[PDB]
Paper text:
The inner shell is an icosahedral capsid formed by 240 copies of hepatitis B core protein (HBc). The N-terminal domain of HBc is mainly α-helical and assembles into dimers, which form protruding spikes at the capsid surface. Peptides based on the hexapeptide “LLGRMK” block the interaction between capsids and L-HBs and inhibit virion formation. These peptides bind to the tips of the spikes where envelope and capsid are in touch but are distant from the hydrophobic pocket.
Model-building showed that peptide-binding splayed the loops at the tips of the spikes apart. The splaying was transmitted throughout the protruding part of the spike tilting the ascending helix α3 and the descending helix α4 outwards. Tilting pivoted at residues G63 in α3 and G94 in α4, respectively. Peptide binding induced the same structural changes of the spike region independent of the HBc variant to which the peptide was bound.
Numbering used by the authors:
A (entry chain C), B (entry chain D): 1 to 144
C (entry chain B): 1 to 150
D (entry chain A): 1 to 143
Write the structure that this text describes.
Amino acid sequence: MDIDTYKEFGATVELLSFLPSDFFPSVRDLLDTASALYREALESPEHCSPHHTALRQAILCWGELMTLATWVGVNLEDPASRDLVVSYVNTNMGLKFRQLLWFHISCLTFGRETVIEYLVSFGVWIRTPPAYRPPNAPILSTLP
Amino acid sequence: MDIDTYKEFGATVELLSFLPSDFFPSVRDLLDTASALYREALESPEHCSPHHTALRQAILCWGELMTLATWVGVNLEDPASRDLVVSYVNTNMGLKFRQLLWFHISCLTFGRETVIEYLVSFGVWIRTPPAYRPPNAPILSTLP
Amino acid sequence: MDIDTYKEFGATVELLSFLPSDFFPSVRDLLDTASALYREALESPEHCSPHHTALRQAILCWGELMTLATWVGVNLEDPASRDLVVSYVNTNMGLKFRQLLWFHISCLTFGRETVIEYLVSFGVWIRTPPAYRPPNAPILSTLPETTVVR
Amino acid sequence: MDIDTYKEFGATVELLSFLPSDFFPSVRDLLDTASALYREALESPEHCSPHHTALRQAILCWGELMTLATWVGVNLEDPASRDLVVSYVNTNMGLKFRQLLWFHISCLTFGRETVIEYLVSFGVWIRTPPAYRPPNAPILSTL
């Protein structure tokens, strides 16, 4: 049906692939961040935000992928093929989910506009030669 | 996080258990329904509604599941066992997705209150022994 | 015909000749930056700005150049000549495109006036011997110096 | 990306594919026309029109493509290969740029809308079977 989840939030897969895949934190770390900062609101019976809804759906989808993959690896005979599957998931869907969770957590925490400006700025930065840029990478911070 | 997607929309995973598993249409049929009725809105850059958001996310996760399963079967040379994983996938992830699509397409087409009342009444009907069970089961509709 | 593309935008090639070649992001980086920030406009049916127009024309010409050079390489069985051909394309036209892509993106982002002032100051800095200039080149950036967003 | 240069000017490549590839005047003729008519404006420090902008960029591009090709031929030892490569440029690079140079000059000279109508009418003419095709092909004219 050709749908982009980021398009409603003013983003795009093109805009998030603008950042390196070695940038987005791990799914464990992001799920922990969420459980810590917005558990009482994700488990809540309220449409608190589109970001909340999307995060719920995304956490559930990661669970549906991990369960399938565990059942699979259990069935497969070769731990080698098991690790091949693991690499495939972690590099193909793991990245998508890292992007998704990062985007939505970051938005809830800082601001959608803040996060998009951060995307463009960090992309231009990491693409710019070091001698002609600020030496310290950008970062998002609630601390003044 | 023990999040239930329906809890936000006033339902629960156990209220939909009022309906059997053989009740829900095929993913194919429900995706066709969506493409027919709410394609322009799902593909929209707007948060038209939580149902739209959730349904977009749901389609993306089904694509992630199908992609993994197909890649697995293809990179595999013994497909006779592929029927086992297909059966597992359907029986589990497939039923969850059929329950998720139906809820949302219905709550868009008819209404959330209407759908919850339908669930209650269908639970009555199907709890009723067949000897005293009318044949004119309840059905969601916009006609008399 | 003696045409300077920059003249229309208040600049020249003498104001950008100072900028070293190590100043410009590689073409792919600059095509990615244009795609990420202005794809919805460049792909639009509107004349939103002379910068958009020039970026469109520049992207098309790079594409034609790449199509000629790849064909040439495929026709060259000597990878040494292929490397010599690539080195020519990267030094003569890759630099020209890198400068043209940078100028227009930077203008769209910051302001043509700001970009020209930056060019003036960078020329002051680069014309200056190292023994007498600061070691940290002037910087054009949307972020503050700390690089922390809130 | 999916950029069409003519899309901003209210056109496409599907609307210029109407005109046969051998319709477009040669690059030399099209540059002489541009010089004569709009040298003082293409060399101007002014955004007189998007057509001027695009035409400047196209001229600079042809120059770069001719520079690469001359260098290549010079560094090339086989005259047959040299002729083949220059033929390739003429068929693929020469066409795109001559189609671009024509569009913009004709627009500057007659009108964007006039040129689009000309494209449509010429498509009619060239679709017409020859027995009913007038020999007086369509042509752009001011007088």
